[PDB]
Amino acid sequence: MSIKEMPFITCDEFNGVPSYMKSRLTYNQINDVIKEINKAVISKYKILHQPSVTRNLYHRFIDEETKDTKGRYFIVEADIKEFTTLKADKKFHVLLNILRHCRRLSEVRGGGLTRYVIT
């Protein structure tokens, strides 16, 4: 089964990112983080497309689905911690600002929960 993935940002894209957003981040660090996010997305949808601790993950996934979330691909901050070596902390969030800026993902909120939908 095919699963949507977020592409690396390009150098020109990186170059165009407003300097302040970039700050500490190098080009490679950003795409390093994209790599981990895709890993989190992949892992989630394999589970969804799967026929036991993994299976209470499945229900949390269902539970998070929204009118606005549709048949779209998404993850939430807990997914990072669950599937990757990334920490969903402060730098992850600076990074998020870049990912959003480059239209790589969007933030969906509702039910007191922030979902990250793959653009």
Author numbering: 1 to 51, 57 to 124
Could you share sentences copied from the article?
The ternary Ska complex, composed of Ska1, Ska2 and Ska3, localizes to the outer KT in a KMN-dependent manner. Although GST–Ska1133–255 is not strictly equivalent to the FL Ska1 dimer in the native complex, and thus might bind MTs differently, it clearly interacted with MTs more efficiently than Ska1133–255.
To understand the structural basis for the ability of human Ska complex to bind MTs, we obtained crystals of the Ska1–MTBD in two different crystal forms that diffracted X-rays to about 2 Å. Models from crystal form I (space group C2221) and II (space group P32) were refined to 2.1 and 2.3 Å with R factors of 19.6 and 22.5, and Rfree factors of 25.1 and 26.8, respectively, and superpose well with an overall root mean square deviation of 0.6 Å. Residues 133–142 are stabilized in an extended conformation, followed by eight α-helical segments (α1–α8) and a C-terminal β-hairpin. The structural analysis showed that the Ska1–MTBD is related to a winged-helix domain, a domain known for its ability to bind DNA and in mediating protein–protein interactions. The Ska1–MTBD differs from the canonical winged-helix domain by the incorporation of two additional modules. Analysis of the electrostatic surface potential revealed the existence of contiguous positively charged patches all over the Ska1–MTBD surface, suggesting the potential involvement of multiple MT contact sites. Although mutations at K170/177 and K135/203/206 showed no major effects on MT binding, mutations at R155/236/245, a region reported recently to be critical for MT binding, together with two new regions identified in this study, K183/184/203/206 and K217/223/226/227, all showed significant reductions in MT binding (Kd=20±4.5, 17.1±5.5 and 14.5±2.8 μM, respectively, versus WT=2.9±0.6 μM), pointing to the existence of multiple MT interaction sites. These results provide clear evidence that the human Ska complex binds MTs through a multipartite binding mode of Ska1–MTBD. Remarkably, the tubulin contact sites are dispersed across the surface of the Ska1–MTBD and distances between different contact sites range between 15 and 30 Å.
